[PDB]
Amino acid sequence: SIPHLILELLKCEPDEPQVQAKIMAYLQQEQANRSKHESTFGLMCKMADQTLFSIVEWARSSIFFRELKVDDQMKLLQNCWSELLILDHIYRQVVHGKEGSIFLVTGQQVDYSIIASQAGATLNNLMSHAQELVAKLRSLQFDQREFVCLKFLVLFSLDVKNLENFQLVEGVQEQVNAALLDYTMCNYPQQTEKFGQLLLRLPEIRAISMQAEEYLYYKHLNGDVPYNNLLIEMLHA
């Protein structure tokens, strides 16, 4: 069966088609309102930017999180926003990913050869490490219930300090943990190592996300970013 807690987590998941179409609609108006005069890396910054907006709106209306004061909500989101972008990216490839291509949040499918030629050494290396996580999570049969659990484990991080209500974050971290432990037992009893193999991806996701953060900030300092959007603001703080 499914622990009641995991059911409550699922009821906070947005309708994936609605957020994809919404982001696609946004980017279509951006370029449509551009002239024929006047990149791809920039086109991803804005895709990742709009994905951040949906991530914020998801957490905002999510159980437990909606009971935190705004100061606490900001500390949690400031700590994990990059992790959620990566985790969201990884899960999209597990679900829709085909070998040799990237599925974007707008639903578009892009060939690797096109991305690899432009991304650069660092981003290529970070994307490849993410694909290794994709292959692993696909071989474990990473499903939606396990996905939302990891989302909340990333969100309610014990690494976040100076919270007014750290006890709530601690409890959510623990009850989500116990629920995932019980979910993988009932629904995947043969996989004695599934639970552990899912948790071991969170530090790997963290490391990729922090490295991605540092690199994008480098590109911002270097002058290679559309300026002042939400993406840049999260990098500042």
């Binding site: 914020v56 709106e57 900001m74 939400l230």
Partner: peptide, 11 residues
Amino acid sequence: NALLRYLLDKD
């Protein structure tokens, strides 16, 4: 982070 607080406060 002015924009983040806005996204959490806006109605």
